[PDB]
Design a protein around this motif. Structure first.
Motif, PDB file in Angstrom:
ATOM      1  N   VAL A 243      -6.426  -4.746   2.261  1.00  0.00           N
ATOM      2  CA  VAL A 243      -6.332  -3.296   2.360  1.00  0.00           C
ATOM      3  C   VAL A 243      -7.676  -2.728   2.797  1.00  0.00           C
ATOM      4  CG1 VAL A 243      -5.841  -1.147   1.155  1.00  0.00           C
ATOM      5  CG2 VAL A 243      -4.560  -3.220   0.574  1.00  0.00           C
TER       6      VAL A 243
ATOM      7  N   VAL B 253      -4.105   8.578 -10.319  1.00  0.00           N
ATOM      8  CA  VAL B 253      -4.731   7.293 -10.027  1.00  0.00           C
ATOM      9  C   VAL B 253      -3.920   6.193 -10.710  1.00  0.00           C
ATOM     10  CG1 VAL B 253      -6.856   5.943 -10.062  1.00  0.00           C
ATOM     11  CG2 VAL B 253      -6.975   8.427  -9.955  1.00  0.00           C
TER      12      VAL B 253
ATOM     13  N   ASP C 283     -16.195   5.694  -7.431  1.00  0.00           N
ATOM     14  CA  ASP C 283     -14.915   5.492  -6.760  1.00  0.00           C
ATOM     15  C   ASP C 283     -14.216   4.201  -7.182  1.00  0.00           C
ATOM     16  OD1 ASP C 283     -12.781   5.927  -5.118  1.00  0.00           O
ATOM     17  OD2 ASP C 283     -13.917   5.937  -3.240  1.00  0.00           O
ATOM     18  N   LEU C 284     -12.897   4.181  -7.004  1.00  0.00           N
ATOM     19  CA  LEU C 284     -12.107   2.957  -7.064  1.00  0.00           C
ATOM     20  C   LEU C 284     -11.497   2.719  -5.689  1.00  0.00           C
ATOM     21  CD1 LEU C 284     -10.122   2.923 -10.456  1.00  0.00           C
ATOM     22  CD2 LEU C 284     -12.033   1.468  -9.774  1.00  0.00           C
ATOM     23  N   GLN C 285     -11.728   1.540  -5.125  1.00  0.00           N
ATOM     24  CA  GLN C 285     -11.227   1.243  -3.789  1.00  0.00           C
ATOM     25  C   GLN C 285     -10.355  -0.004  -3.766  1.00  0.00           C
ATOM     26  OE1 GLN C 285     -15.068   1.315  -1.700  1.00  0.00           O
ATOM     27  NE2 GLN C 285     -14.306   3.006  -0.434  1.00  0.00           N
ATOM     28  N   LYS C 286      -9.108   0.169  -3.347  1.00  0.00           N
ATOM     29  CA  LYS C 286      -8.198  -0.953  -3.181  1.00  0.00           C
ATOM     30  C   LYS C 286      -8.541  -1.710  -1.907  1.00  0.00           C
ATOM     31  CE  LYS C 286      -4.115  -0.420  -4.575  1.00  0.00           C
ATOM     32  NZ  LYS C 286      -2.700  -0.015  -4.791  1.00  0.00           N
ATOM     33  N   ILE C 287      -8.894  -2.982  -2.053  1.00  0.00           N
ATOM     34  CA  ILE C 287      -9.203  -3.814  -0.899  1.00  0.00           C
ATOM     35  C   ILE C 287      -8.206  -4.964  -0.793  1.00  0.00           C
ATOM     36  CG2 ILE C 287     -11.653  -3.242  -1.066  1.00  0.00           C
ATOM     37  CD1 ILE C 287     -12.156  -5.912  -2.313  1.00  0.00           C
ATOM     38  N   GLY C 288      -7.290  -5.040  -1.752  1.00  0.00           N
ATOM     39  CA  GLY C 288      -6.266  -6.068  -1.705  1.00  0.00           C
ATOM     40  C   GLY C 288      -4.990  -5.727  -2.447  1.00  0.00           C
ATOM     41  N   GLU C 289      -3.902  -6.374  -2.041  1.00  0.00           N
ATOM     42  CA  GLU C 289      -2.639  -6.304  -2.765  1.00  0.00           C
ATOM     43  C   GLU C 289      -1.743  -7.473  -2.373  1.00  0.00           C
ATOM     44  OE1 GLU C 289      -0.605  -2.704  -1.858  1.00  0.00           O
ATOM     45  OE2 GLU C 289      -0.011  -3.323   0.164  1.00  0.00           O
ATOM     46  N   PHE C 290      -0.781  -7.788  -3.232  1.00  0.00           N
ATOM     47  CA  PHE C 290       0.197  -8.820  -2.923  1.00  0.00           C
ATOM     48  C   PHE C 290       1.561  -8.182  -2.712  1.00  0.00           C
ATOM     49  CE2 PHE C 290      -3.172 -11.207  -4.920  1.00  0.00           C
ATOM     50  CZ  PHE C 290      -3.218 -12.365  -4.171  1.00  0.00           C
ATOM     51  N   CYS C 291       2.228  -8.571  -1.632  1.00  0.00           N
ATOM     52  CA  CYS C 291       3.493  -7.955  -1.260  1.00  0.00           C
ATOM     53  C   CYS C 291       4.634  -8.966  -1.222  1.00  0.00           C
ATOM     54  CB  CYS C 291       3.365  -7.261   0.097  1.00  0.00           C
ATOM     55  SG  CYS C 291       2.217  -5.863   0.101  1.00  0.00           S
TER      56      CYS C 291
ATOM     57  N   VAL D 178       3.138 -12.605  -0.467  1.00  0.00           N
ATOM     58  CA  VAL D 178       2.059 -12.769   0.500  1.00  0.00           C
ATOM     59  C   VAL D 178       0.913 -11.831   0.155  1.00  0.00           C
ATOM     60  CG1 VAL D 178       3.616 -13.474   2.363  1.00  0.00           C
ATOM     61  CG2 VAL D 178       2.980 -11.067   2.130  1.00  0.00           C
TER      62      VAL D 178
ATOM     63  N   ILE E  49      -6.321  -5.937  -5.680  1.00  0.00           N
ATOM     64  CA  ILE E  49      -7.753  -6.211  -5.658  1.00  0.00           C
ATOM     65  C   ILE E  49      -8.512  -4.904  -5.433  1.00  0.00           C
ATOM     66  CG2 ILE E  49      -9.551  -7.731  -4.778  1.00  0.00           C
ATOM     67  CD1 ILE E  49      -7.250  -9.318  -5.720  1.00  0.00           C
ATOM     68  N   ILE E  50      -9.339  -4.538  -6.409  1.00  0.00           N
ATOM     69  CA  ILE E  50      -9.987  -3.230  -6.443  1.00  0.00           C
ATOM     70  C   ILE E  50     -11.508  -3.325  -6.587  1.00  0.00           C
ATOM     71  CG2 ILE E  50     -10.255  -1.111  -7.822  1.00  0.00           C
ATOM     72  CD1 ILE E  50      -7.356  -1.145  -8.442  1.00  0.00           C
TER      73      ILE E  50
ATOM     74  N   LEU F  60      -1.239   4.632  -8.695  1.00  0.00           N
ATOM     75  CA  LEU F  60      -1.648   3.950  -7.475  1.00  0.00           C
ATOM     76  C   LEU F  60      -2.044   2.500  -7.739  1.00  0.00           C
ATOM     77  CD1 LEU F  60      -3.800   6.768  -5.825  1.00  0.00           C
ATOM     78  CD2 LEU F  60      -1.490   6.063  -5.189  1.00  0.00           C
ATOM     79  N   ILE F  61      -1.753   2.013  -8.941  1.00  0.00           N
ATOM     80  CA  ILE F  61      -2.215   0.692  -9.350  1.00  0.00           C
ATOM     81  C   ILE F  61      -1.072  -0.226  -9.775  1.00  0.00           C
ATOM     82  CG2 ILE F  61      -3.689  -0.578 -10.959  1.00  0.00           C
ATOM     83  CD1 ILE F  61      -5.503   1.787 -11.129  1.00  0.00           C
TER      84      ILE F  61
ATOM     85  N   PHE G 198      -9.031   1.593   0.579  1.00  0.00           N
ATOM     86  CA  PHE G 198      -8.259   2.767   0.197  1.00  0.00           C
ATOM     87  C   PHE G 198      -8.836   3.368  -1.086  1.00  0.00           C
ATOM     88  CE2 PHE G 198      -4.521   4.774  -1.897  1.00  0.00           C
ATOM     89  CZ  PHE G 198      -4.252   5.735  -0.946  1.00  0.00           C
TER      90      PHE G 198
END
Lengths: 108, 109
Positions: B102, A55, A88-96, B98, A64-65, A58-59, B105
């Protein structure tokens, strides 16, 4: 919603959305487990979360979790979040990162 | 085109495309002028470059930049690129941030 400022030692069934500020470096327990401390936060403040094994990989900062059925306790002085085994931990966001060409902007 | 590995001290009129790896750090003089030294590179290797004042301060890591009429000297023991008078730095590439939603996940999938 629940907020980081409202989190105290002993709290249970924590449902909390946060963003990762920091991902600390990983240490190893007596039994070969990988444990990593992350600094996460919302607008009301920040808090540590302890994350175990894969885990931890994966961070990233910016993630955003959503934490489900988490709980809080004290570890080595620090207030700390934990995932509940039935949670649970759920990723609902990220910056790319996205590449963009630039029309020869001159530094001068 | 010119490549970092082929750069020696005293080499002038250097035209070089490179990417910024480190925005590095700032030395401030007593007369109030700042120079920040960055670590930049191409496929053949890395090199330091010193930039004065405003020139190097929207230099970000990941930036693709073309130096024209630069010159190579030694600074603090390291090989260092400078912008020669009549020379220029041009940002031709960059990486921008940007947001990306997600779709739930689970970390214990």
């Amino acid at each position: 919603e629940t907020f980081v400022k409202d989190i105290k030692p002993g709290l249970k069934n924590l449902n909390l959305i946060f963003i990762v500020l920091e991902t600390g470096r990983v240490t190893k327990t007596k039994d070969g487990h990988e444990v990593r401390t992350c600094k996460v936060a919302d607008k009301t403040g920040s808090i540590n979360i302890s994350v175990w094994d894969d885990v931890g990989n994966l961070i990233q900062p910016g993630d955003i979790i959503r934490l489900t059925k988490g709980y809080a306790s004290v570890f080595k002085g620090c207030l700390t979040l934990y995932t509940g085994r039935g949670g649970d931990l759920q990723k609902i966001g990220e910056f790319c990162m996205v590449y963009s060409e630039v029309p020869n902007f001159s530094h001068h």
